[PDB]
Amino acid sequence: AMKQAIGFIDSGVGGLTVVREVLKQLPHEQVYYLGDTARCPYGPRDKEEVAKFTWEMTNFLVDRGIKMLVIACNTATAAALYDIREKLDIPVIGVIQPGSRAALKATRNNKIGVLGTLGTVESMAYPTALKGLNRRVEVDSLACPKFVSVVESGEYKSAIAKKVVAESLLPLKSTKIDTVILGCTHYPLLKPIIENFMGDGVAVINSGEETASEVSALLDYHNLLDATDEEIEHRFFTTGSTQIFKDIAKDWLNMPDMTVEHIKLG
C-alpha cells in the first residue's frame, strides 16, 4: 500500500484526543495508534524509564511503518521528544508546545493554569515552554493524580468523575487564572465536567486541535501529505485489554468499526 500512517503513542487512551483532531483536519491520513495501557500510569515514573517506554513504543510503530510520529503524551514529550526527534529522520512532535501556543492565544489577562500528572508538573516543561514564548505570562501548575485512572476506567462521564474534578480543581478558584491547559492528553475526556466546574470565565484548553494543525503543517511542509484514494485502514494497538479500549475509543471517536489489537512491549 502507498498510504503511510502517522504514528501516535501514549500511556493509554489520552492520545485519542489528538487523533480526533487529526481525523477532522487531515481526513485522508491513516492513523497508527499505540496506547501502553498495561504500564499506565506513566505519571509517577522517573524520566529515564518513561523515555525507555517511549522508545519501545516508537520502535514498535517505526517497524509497522510510519511517515511521522506524534508523542501524544505529555510526560513522554518531556522525557524523550528531543532524543527521538534527533535520532529519527521522520518528523516528530509532542503535545506541550502546541498547548502552550493555544493557551497563550486564549488568555486575556496572562494568568495561565496547567493541569497535569506528577511527572509533567515536576518536569517544569509547561512553565519553561510558556515563558520561552512570552516571559511575562504567569504560570501555575496543579497535579491531578486521580484523573488518569478515572478516564482509563471509563468513569469520566459519571458522578464520581464530577466529584474528583471538584475536589482537585477547587484551588484554582482562589486565583485569577483565566485559562487552564489540559496538560495531560487524557484530561479532555473530563472537559465538560471541568468547564461546568470552572464556569464561563475560564477557557479550558484541549491541546489536540493545535497539535493536529502542526501535524498538517509539517506534512504539507515536507510534501508528505497523502495524495491517494486508497482505503484508509486505521490501526489501534494496546498493551491492555482491547474491549475496554474499544469502549472508550468508540465513545470519543465517531468510529463503530474500529480495529483494536493487543500487543507486547519489552
Q: Interface with Cl ion by CB under 5 A: which residues?
A: 14, 43, 74-75, 117-118, 120, 145, 184-185
Please enumerate in sequence order all residues whose Cβ is within 8 A of that of 200, keeping only pairs 6 or more positions apart, or say none: none
113 annotated as ligand-binding: no
Binding residue for its own copies, selected from 27, 199, 256, 266, defined by CB under 8 A:
27
Interface size with its own copies, residues (CB under 8 A): 31
The torsion of the CA quartet 42, 46, 51, 56, rounded to 10 degrees, works out to -60
Residues in 117-136 at the binding interface with its own copies, rule: CB under 8 A: 131-136
Q: Closer to its own copies by CB, 135 or 264: give it.
A: 135
87 near its own copies, rule: CB under 8 A: no
218 near its own copies, rule: CB under 8 A: yes
3-state DSSP call for residue 173?
helix
The listed partner (Cl ion, its own copies, none) that binds 7, CB under 5 to 8 Å by sort, is: none
The listed partner (Cl ion, its own copies, none) that binds 145, CB under 5 to 8 Å by sort, is: Cl ion
185 annotated as ligand-binding: yes
Residues in 229-258 at the binding interface with its own copies, rule: CB under 8 A: 229
90: left (phi over 0), alpha (psi -120 to 50) or beta: beta
Active site residue 184: yes
204 near its own copies, rule: CB under 8 A: no
Please enumerate in sequence order all residues whose Cβ is within 8 A of that of 140, keeping only pairs 6 or more positions apart, or say none: 111, 112, 113, 114, 175, 177
Please enumerate in sequence order all residues whose Cβ is within 8 A of that of 126, keeping only pairs 6 or more positions apart, or say none: 96, 99, 100, 114, 116, 120, 139, 141, 181, 183
Cβ(235)–Cβ(33) below 8 Å:
yes
Residue carrying the nine cell digits 501514549: 10
Alpha carbon distance 69, 85 (integer Å): 9
3-state DSSP call for residue 35?
strand
Binding residue for its own copies, selected from 90, 118, 225, 244, defined by CB under 8 A:
225
The listed partner (Cl ion, its own copies, none) that binds 27, CB under 5 to 8 Å by sort, is: its own copies
74 annotated as ligand-binding: yes
Task: Check the chain for breaks (C–N over 2.5 Å) and list the residue before each, or none.
Answer: none
DSSP 186: T
Is 14 exposed, middle or buried (CB count within 10 Å of its CB: 0-12, 13-18, 19+)?
Answer: buried
Q: Closer to its own copies by CB, 99 or 113: give it.
A: 99
101 near its own copies, rule: CB under 8 A: yes
Considering the candidates 22, 61, 180, 184, report the single residue annotated as catalytic. Answer: 184
228 near its own copies, rule: CB under 8 A: yes
Considering the candidates 73, 103, 190, 249, report the single residue annotated as catalytic. Answer: 73
Residues marked as catalytic: 73, 184
Binding residues: 10-11, 42-43, 74-75, 185-186
Contact residues for its own copies, defined by CB under 8 A: 24-28, 93, 97-98, 101-102, 104-105, 131-136, 209-210, 213-214, 216-218, 220-221, 225, 227-229
